[PDB]
Design a protein around this ligand. Sequence first.
Ligand SMILES: [Zn+2]
Ligand SMILES: [Zn+2]
Ligand SMILES: [Zn+2]
Ligand SMILES: [Zn+2]
Lengths: 182, 186, 182, 186
Amino acid sequence: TPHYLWIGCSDSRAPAEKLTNLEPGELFVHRNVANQVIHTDFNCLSVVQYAVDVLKIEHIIICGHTNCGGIHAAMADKDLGLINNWLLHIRDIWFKHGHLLGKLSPEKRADMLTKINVAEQVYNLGRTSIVKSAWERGQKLSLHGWVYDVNDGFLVDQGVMATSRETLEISYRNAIARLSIL
Amino acid sequence: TPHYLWIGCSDSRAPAEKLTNLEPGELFVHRNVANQVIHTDFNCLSVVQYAVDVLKIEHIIICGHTNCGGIHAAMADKDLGLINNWLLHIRDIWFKHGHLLGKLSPEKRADMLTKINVAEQVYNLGRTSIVKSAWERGQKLSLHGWVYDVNDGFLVDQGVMATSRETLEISYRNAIARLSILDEEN
Amino acid sequence: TPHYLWIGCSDSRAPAEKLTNLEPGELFVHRNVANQVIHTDFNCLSVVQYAVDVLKIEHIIICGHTNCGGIHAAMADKDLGLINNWLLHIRDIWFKHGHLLGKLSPEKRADMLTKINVAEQVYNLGRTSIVKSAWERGQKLSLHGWVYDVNDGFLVDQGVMATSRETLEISYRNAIARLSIL
Amino acid sequence: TPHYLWIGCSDSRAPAEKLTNLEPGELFVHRNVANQVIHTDFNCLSVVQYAVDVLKIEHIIICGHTNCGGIHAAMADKDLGLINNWLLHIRDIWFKHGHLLGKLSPEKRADMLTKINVAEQVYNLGRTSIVKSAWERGQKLSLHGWVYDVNDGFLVDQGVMATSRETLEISYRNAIARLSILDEEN
Ligand SMILES: [Zn+2]
Ligand SMILES: [Zn+2]
Ligand SMILES: [Zn+2]
Ligand SMILES: [Zn+2]
């Protein structure tokens, strides 16, 4: 039985098993474009719900990365077809943090959005009825929000780690406060 | 740039990177429970559209595996919650091949069903609007159904391989025929 | 509070409130194309789950109809775009009952499929984890499968009515056995 | 044939047929909880694509209403199960207009939020790939945001009405500005 659920991105070069360096099967893995946790996505809700309620997994890691093709896709103002609808959720995130990103040199702006995106997805995860219910009934469950940079493997527990609904709130706010120092 | 979409299972202990020994960078990876391509699942369908239409990928591979928690979770007639709805499509397939699976020794059914699942997911995939258009406008897109087993670490291209609607019908039907040939240790 | 959930089709001319002739607000209403209950559709699962667990509704009616544009769309072998994916589920139903429909004069074949489609959707509904759980915990809950014909309003409780998992099975099988007499 | 898509709420006590007094046959109807158009919801997005691309409908109307069980269910900070995930998008919007809704008398917030919801659903709808392409290729498609109230039985076209990406920006922003004008019985 695995002890981690890894929500990652579909164009991320690095396998999870390299990055966590957990032995094989400690890991349960979902990968979507831009590593989203969308409120109403059955595919991923299901994964979380099974992980949490049935596998009794105790740690969930959302992992994003620099140079992420899906974050690029999202920012591009272009008619890509069905996927554009998937990437609206990232565009909302962008809009939400517009003053912040607006202040950045254009080039460093996608990297900011990868980091921001992770914090927001972690928050969504903590706000699912599965994770809410677990914390409410006293189950041990941690949420983690990592961005890794291809430029020498490096991984940072982006401000977000949460073990409760209270601490989910503190962590995300601090995370955004801290992305906002330039 | 990637030339391959791998649709695989959230259980799979082993990366596509390992399973195909392509350099990581070649693969573009979706993973979900029991490697499904459900007709109306926005998540996977989006992965597929992006890959085919934007990334321009000529090869999609759906890779199931033996000893699969999801398949066993599908067959365990249990009240697991939300996830059961997701695994209902797997039971649809169980039901659809129930005579084959019935004429068969119990401790072998999960693995038969893992193999049958791959056949059907590829059928589903070749019937997405995304893949049909691609094929209709002359794009080069090969779909593959693989199954891997850990005991010996090796794959086998589950008779499923399509480069056309034409060929999808034939390999799908063939896969099911080869699957229906039972070596009598049931 | 309503006492019925009505799952209907989006191109069905007749409002539910005409057909059930329930007073207003006895009714809680979802409408999709070809009145599907798809296993993994969040929109509709949500509706059922809220109806059943929160509104404590005691009757769910899936309602289809003759001359249904969505059933026509499904049968047509044509590139309609995103919707084709929605209508694959109806195409599966068609394939499943191919011998039967194969035997019918082409013209009467879409009407058969509307009827068959309803029985299958009712079954899916009875197989959701929401409805399974309700019956398991002793909640009173009936499932109903109606096809109505524009040609003089007429509505028939298509073989399917279910109040338990056992009776869901008997009813659907009898329903199909009975569609199969020509 | 229909010339109109109505996206409305599963609570609404009243048919679109009544609400618009078009002959039934003109309307093509989707109904879900809190009249949402979620970016990635296959159900509604499919209704929308079919209508726009196949049925060739020049008018989509999203119609919310006062005294809405879904909106109140959204705001009730309660553990309702699966449905809460669906209503999280409504709380996203609550949160996004929290200052407006905070400067406002409690028994009025649900109805403000019903109105704000309609503005946002139409924004979402005009940003679907389906509606953007339509508009880009010169199709005639007007999107409308309405809210009805039973007390007086009448509607009001919630400042939201778009025939272009251009005009969508303007009415959306305008809707929110008119909404932000508070007659002081908060
Ligand atoms: Zn990426
Ligand atoms: Zn597996
Ligand atoms: Zn219809
Ligand atoms: Zn309502």
